[PDB]
């Protein structure tokens, strides 16, 4: 089956990886941008958007990190397919 | 017996008092009064030779136990690629990798170059920390740091710490002597330490060292 | 030039030895020629232990430089005893009858290397430890030249010729160490005896010299 294959594992791993990287202060999020030197500094947030998450994780945060992790997983699976590893 | 001060363990027995140099008073571990060749008269050179001797002793203890351990374990049931220590390095280029305990899923290393590179990086960091200082201790004794080595708290009570120091350096000098013996028993025989021990304990009359006393003769 | 001491003395570079001879080599010891270009003996304690080590090396090298030439020197007369070279002389222990001293069978003729090895270890440890510390012939004296029973013939008196014979001893000893290193490497490279090398050099010097054996240790691989 697909659910449980290498592609699905890699994709969920990449998506949850970016999500847990943004949630636990290891990746740039809505509330924390970066400078030229990649140091996490806060943001204006340009609207203000609420969230019940203790850290402040938002629906925008999950959309952004889902898109990034989906790009990462797509690229990884099609690369491993490209070098014959998959 | 006290291993410090004026009357201590001396290398020529109960009659060596002429053979003691003036600079070997005995305020350091393992002082037997043996500098009859006189290379360690300068106190700073005495410091450098002491740290040289202690780290040679510790590395030769590790090397003696590593010379004897896989050869003894070769007869205890497990079989490696090579069991003797002087061919224990050449098991990289054998087909099928360097298995650690013989098991093919333990290490299985085929590349000696990246192995030496990773060793060079980690060993350069360890020895730079050992001489200068680093994250497991910044400024301490150059030979006996504490607080991260001996974490079990046996370095306290400085009289038994002094006894532990002289015991460490005596076991280390014995292991240095045996490492030199391992080197020459490698070059004149080609068989390992416990292999030569079985060769001696089989018949000691002819299979002593003088069985190989004519090997390096010239032509 | 008739002195081996003082500030002006025979030196190892001859007339080229004024810019040499540093301050701690003053000529106060037998055999001072100003040769400390490596600078190994700045400390007089280090210098004292190096002088003791050099002179016992000198005594053992004068013993060795004659004990290596006399088996071939009695093989010159035609006395056959197993082998005459010194670097293959130990294996006569493991012969069919054992190592004989002069070849005549009623002589020493010992067979076991381990028993005479143990005897050598015990009496040489005792003798050398008496040499370093002291024993039944003088307890605390010079570690270099004890004398007493070591001079039964009375050459230790009149200290100027004692110093002169000290310089003679260290000069013949340095020549003997040089000769013994030459013996070692003539055994290593040529593989024949040194007196046999002398016979081969006197038979043909121009083609048989060290440069004939210059291409032996060439690593082929």
């Amino acid at each position: 089956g697909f659910i449980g294959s290498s592609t699905n594992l890699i994709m969920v791993a990449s998506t949850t990886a970016t999500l847990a990287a943004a949630r636990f202060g290891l990746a740039p999020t809505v509330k924390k941008n970066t400078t030229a030197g990649l140091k996490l500094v806060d943001s204006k947030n340009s609207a203000g958007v609420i969230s019940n998450d203790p850290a402040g994780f938002t629906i925008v945060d999950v959309l952004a990190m889902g898109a990034a992790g989906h790009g990462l997983g797509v690229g990884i699976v099609l690369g491993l397919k490209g070098i014959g590893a998959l | 017996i006290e291993f410090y001060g004026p009357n201590r363990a001396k290398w020529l027995g109960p009659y060596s008092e002429n053979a003691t140099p003036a600079y070997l008073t005995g305020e350091f571990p393992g002082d037997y009064g043996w500098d009859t060749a006189g290379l360690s008269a300068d106190p700073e050179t005495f410091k450098r030779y002491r740290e040289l001797e202690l780290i040679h002793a510790r590395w030769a203890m590790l090397g003696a136990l590593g010379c004897i351990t896989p050869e003894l374990l070769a007869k205890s049931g497990t079989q490696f690629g090579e069991a003797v220590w002087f061919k224990a390095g050449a098991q990289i280029f054998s087909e099928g990798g360097l298995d650690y305990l013989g098991n093919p899923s333990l290490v299985h290393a085929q590349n000696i170059v990246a192995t030496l590179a990773v060793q060079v990086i980690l060993m350069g960091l360890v020895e730079g920390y050992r001489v200068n200082g680093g994250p497991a201790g910044e400024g301490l004794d150059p030979l006996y740091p504490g607080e991260s080595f001996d974490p079990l708290g046996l370095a306290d009570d400085p009289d038994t710490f002094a006894e532990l120091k002289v015991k460490e350096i005596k076991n280390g000098r014995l292991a240095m002597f045996s490492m030199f013996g391992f080197f020459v028993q490698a070059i004149v025989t080609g068989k390992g330490p416990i292999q030569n021990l079985d060769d001696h304990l089989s018949n000691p009359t002819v299979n002593n060292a003088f069985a190989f006393a004519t090997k390096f003769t010239p032509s | 030039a008739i002195e081996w001491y003082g500030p002006d003395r025979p030196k190892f570079l001859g007339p080229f030895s004024e810019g040499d001879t540093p301050a701690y080599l003053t000529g106060e010891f037998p055999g001072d020629y100003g040769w400390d270009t490596a600078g190994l003996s700045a400390d007089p304690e280090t210098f004292k232990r190096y002088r003791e080590l050099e002179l016992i090396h000198a005594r053992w090298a004068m013993l060795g430089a004659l004990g290596c030439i006399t088996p071939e020197l009695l093989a010159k007369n035609g006395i056959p005893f197993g082998e005459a070279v010194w670097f293959k002389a130990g294996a006569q222990i493991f012969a069919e009858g054992g190592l004989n001293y002069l070849g005549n069978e009623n002589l020493i003729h010992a067979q076991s290397i381990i028993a005479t090895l143990a005897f050598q270890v015990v009496v040489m440890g005792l003798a050398e430890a008496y040499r370093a510390n002291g024993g039944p012939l003088g307890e605390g004296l010079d570690p270099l030249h004890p004398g007493g029973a070591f001079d039964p013939l009375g050459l230790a008196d009149d200290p100027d010729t004692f110093a002169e014979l000290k310089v003679k001893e260290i000069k013949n000893g340095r020549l003997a160490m040089f000769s013994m290193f030459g013996f070692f490497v003539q055994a290593i490279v040529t593989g024949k005896g040194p007196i046999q090398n002398l016979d081969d050099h006197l038979a043909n010097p121009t083609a048989v010299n060290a440069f004939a054996y210059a291409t032996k240790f060439t690593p082929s691989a």
């Binding site: 400078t35 030229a36 030197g37 070098i83 | - | -």
Partner: protein
């Protein structure tokens, strides 16, 4: 520019670690075997091209040599690496971030 009244002689802030680290950061990755090269590397094929072109030393390389490709790509990446290395070194040393 109220400052800069003499055109300082150290207009380029030379750290000798920069060229070394750029050559290292481009060339060591330039010696990784990729199957597009047939298991060989860009820099390895470059040294091979220079070896073949050094055989006929006076005459220069041809137009269909494939030496020029390796040269130009290797130097593109190399100059970019060295340039960005100097930039980064004097941006970390100076401000700019």
């Amino acid at each position: 520019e109220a400052s800069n009244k003499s055109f300082p002689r150290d207009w380029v802030k030379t750290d000798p670690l920069v060229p070394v680290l750029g050559f290292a950061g481009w060339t060591i990755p330039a010696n990784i075997g990729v199957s597009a090269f047939g298991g060989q590397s860009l820099f390895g094929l470059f040294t091979q091209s220079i070896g073949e072109n050094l055989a006929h030393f006076p005459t220069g390389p041809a137009l269909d040599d494939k030496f020029w490709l390796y040269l130009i790509t290797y130097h593109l990446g190399l100059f970019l690496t060295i340039t960005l290395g100097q930039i980064g070194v004097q941006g970390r040393k100076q401000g700019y971030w």
